[PDB]
């Protein structure tokens with residue numbers, strides 16, 4: 001059995017359709033009696049500078065491949081055991097997105113084709129039901145919610161997917177309806193986050209001081225990613241949140257507008273460049289504030305919980321999975337946000353059961369995936 005996983009982004013672009021399909025591949029290919037190939041976009045150097053930390057650019061696919069293997073080997077315990085292939089892509093800046101150039105199916109000879117996983121089937125289907133036996137799409141994005149919010153897809157998405165995908169996994173119910181679909185959060189968290197939570201637990205037990213008493217958000221700096229709602233909440237409740245310090249981390253097109261809004265508040269809210277969420281600078285924040293209502297599943301929330309933090313997030317259907325965790329505090333309104341945030345700053349995060357830590361893991365996500373995709 002051979003699984004070909006086609007996605008719309010690659011490390012070092014720190015975005016869900018880069019990070020999650022990469023872990024998926026790592027943990028599928030460990031499952032043992034199964035060959036995994038991950039198929040990722042190659043950008044020319046001009047486009048690479050747009051999405052990579054231009055610290056990081058590759059003059060060939062082979063370099064990018066060494067870099068992606070290194071990055072993932074640094075993060076998982078085991079030796080990787082899947083293959084990596086590239087298709088040519090082009091970053092369309094107005095789509096905020098990588099568009100394929102060839103038939104991407106081409107990356108996989110006919111002679112080895114078996115099962116195809118399309119991360120973001122909507123774009124990747126702009127060959128399929130006829131070149132592979134079995135095609136599974138995974139919906140990572142709320143396409144509708146992001147184009148309907150630029151300073152339609154809709155019915156084409158339905159049939160596009162339906163024509164090409166035998167099964168459709170929606171990461172949550174904050175998505176378009178789709179044919180042959182199941183809701184299932186088939187993502188976990190980089191095991192580094194769980195390791196960081198076990199280290200913060202051990203510090204708590206040692207009474208080191210695990211935590212500083214401010215908050216942070218991390219995510220690409222576009223208004224529609226939570227920033228707009230966070231800044232309005234902050235601005236509405238400035239007076240009650242006088243003691244709150246908030247650090248915001250990300251890159252993107254709105255970073256200068258967000259900065260500008262931040263310095264008009266009577267709160268210390270600071271804006272900084274994007275950075276890997278697993279970096280040591282994040283390790284001691286006690287509270288992660290996530291007000292996105294446009295994510296399908298907020299991988300960053302999963303990551304923050306794994307690290308042992310308290311997450312204050314919107315009481316919205318995309319956060320339904322996280323509500324099983326006691327350190328996840330949901331709010332229906334501005335008052336709820338403030339009360340939840342003030343209580344969290346004041347208190348100790350609670351500790352995660354072993355059953356919780358497992359539920360956030362890629363080992364668990366893979367089992368769910370294997371199960372909802374009839375791959376048994």
Ligand SMILES: O=c1ccn([C@@H]2O[C@H](COP(=O)(O)OP(=O)(O)O[C@H]3O[C@H](CO)[C@H](O)[C@H](O)[C@H]3O)[C@@H](O)[C@H]2O)c(=O)[nH]1
Nearest residue numbers: 014015016017019140219250274275276277295296297299
């Ligand atoms: O500055 C950053 C930004 C992101 N990340 C990492 O990137 C991954 C995804 O981050 P986000 O979910 O903030 O990035 P995207 O919004 O760009 O992810 C996309 O897909 C996800 C699911 O795969 C989400 O559900 C969302 O709908 C969609 O835009 C996480 O591992 C997060 O830690 C960083 O390390 N640093």
